[PDB]
């Protein structure tokens, strides 16, 4: 046979490049996944991740309370935190023994897979009682925030999209939903509506609290080939198109 890395008959090298290309492109086909992650960052350094992975479209919707830190199998000041919630829902509505709950998120990062169409992204960032914009009567139920998403890039390739917002002020108390649609550069969609209804049931969800962004990078992002952007603006992910 020819010697490796010297001719157009390195079929191991061609197949390696095809295998990676086929992953990148399959994910972009309508048979592929589109995925979203919400990361909620807490003052103790831990991070709640919620991920949804589904065909055609995907999203996540959480209450104010659901986004608060919950430490499984440890103390959570449960009763005092019920009272903190009452005061967050309406000023002076509760009788808590603290000014600021450390279970409140300090920041949110939303990441989508590179199979999303950025122009389809919509976010409903509500107040603590799940109202998008002060009162329901004046609320558009979403804002299309695609323009704000940064490309997460590795080796020149877009591996995902990131929108990051801090919640550093006492009044930053939110409920949150986000949604994106998988790329569809075709004009195909009539005939497939029941399949999209089935995708609503088929969407897989994951949620977990990791103890540190390091741990998120090491045990969540990296093992799964997920895109990420860390606090130091470092991009993670795996470039696949036309690559060995």
By the rule CB under 8 A, 59 interacts with a second copy:
yes
By the rule CB under 8 A, 60 interacts with a second copy:
yes
Q: Quote the CA–CA distance of 115 and 19 in Å, as a whole number.
A: 18
Binding residues for a second copy, rule CB under 8 A, total: 95
Q: In the complex with a second copy, which residue's Cβ is closer, 7 or 141?
A: 141
Q: In the complex with Cl ion, which residue's Cβ is closer, 30 or 181?
A: 30
Residue with tokens 């006492």: 170
Query: Which range binds a second copy by CB under 8 A, 9-17, 123-131, 149-157, 164-172?
Result: 123-131
Contact yes or no for 153/85 (Cβ under 8 A)? no
Q: Quote the CA–CA distance of 40 and 166 in Å, as a whole number.
A: 10
Query: For 165, phi and psi rounded to 5 degrees?
Result: -140, 130
Query: For 13, phi and psi rounded to 5 degrees?
Result: -70, -40
Q: In the complex with a second copy, which residue's Cβ is closer, 147 or 193?
A: 193
- Considering only residues 168, 171, 223, 232, which one is a binding residue for a second copy as defined by CB under 8 A? 223
Residue with tokens 């977990």: 208
By the rule CB under 5 A, 117 interacts with Cl ion:
no
Region 20-39 residues binding a second copy, contact defined as CB under 8 A? 23-24, 26-27, 31-33, 35
By the rule CB under 5 A, 184 interacts with Cl ion:
no
Reduced 3-state DSSP string for 174-243: CEEEEEEEECCCCCCCCCCHHHHHHHHHHCEEEEEEECCHHHHHHHHHHHHCCCEECCCCCEECCCCCCC
By the rule CB under 5 A, 29 interacts with Cl ion:
yes
- With residues binned 3-state (H G I as helix, E B as strand, rest as coil), the percentages for the chain, rounded to 5, are 25, 30, 45
Q: In the complex with Cl ion, which residue's Cβ is closer, 102 or 198?
A: 198
By the rule CB under 8 A, 86 interacts with a second copy:
yes
Name the binder of 85 from Cl ion, a second copy, none, CB < 5-8 A by kind. Answer: a second copy
By the rule CB under 8 A, 231 interacts with a second copy:
no
By the rule CB under 8 A, 139 interacts with a second copy:
yes
By the rule CB under 5 A, 30 interacts with Cl ion:
yes
What residues make contact with Cl ion under the rule CB under 5 A? 29-30
């Amino acid at each position: 046979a020819d010697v490796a890395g010297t001719s157009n008959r390195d079929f191991r090298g061609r197949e390696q490049r095809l295998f990676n290309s086929e992953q990148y492109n399959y994910n972009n086909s309508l048979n592929g996944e589109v995925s979203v992650w919400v990361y909620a960052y807490y003052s103790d350094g831990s991070v709640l991740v919620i991920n949804k992975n589904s065909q055609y479209k995907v999203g996540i919707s959480e209450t104010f309370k659901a986004l608060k830190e919950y430490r499984e199998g440890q103390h959570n000041d449960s009763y005092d935190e019920y009272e903190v919630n009452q005061s967050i829902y309406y000023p002076n509505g509760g009788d808590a023994r603290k000014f600021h709950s450390n279970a409140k998120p300090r920041a949110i990062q939303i990441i989508f897979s590179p199979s999303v169409n950025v122009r389809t992204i919509k976010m409903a960032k509500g107040n603590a009682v799940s109202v998008p914009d002060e009162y329901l009567q004046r609320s558009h139920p979403w804002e299309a925030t695609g323009i704000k998403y940064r490309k997460i890039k590795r080796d020149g390739e877009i591996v995902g999209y990131s929108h990051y917002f801090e919640l550093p002020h006492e009044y930053n108390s939110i409920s949150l939903a986000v949604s994106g649609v998988h790329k569809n550069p075709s004009s195909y969609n009539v005939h497939n509506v029941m399949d999209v209804f089935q995708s609503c049931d088929l969407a897989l969800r994951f949620c977990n609290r990791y103890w540190a962004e390091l741990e998120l990078v090491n045990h969540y992002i990296s093992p799964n080939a997920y895109p990420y952007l860390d606090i130091n603006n470092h991009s993670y992910g795996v470039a696949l198109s036309n690559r060995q």
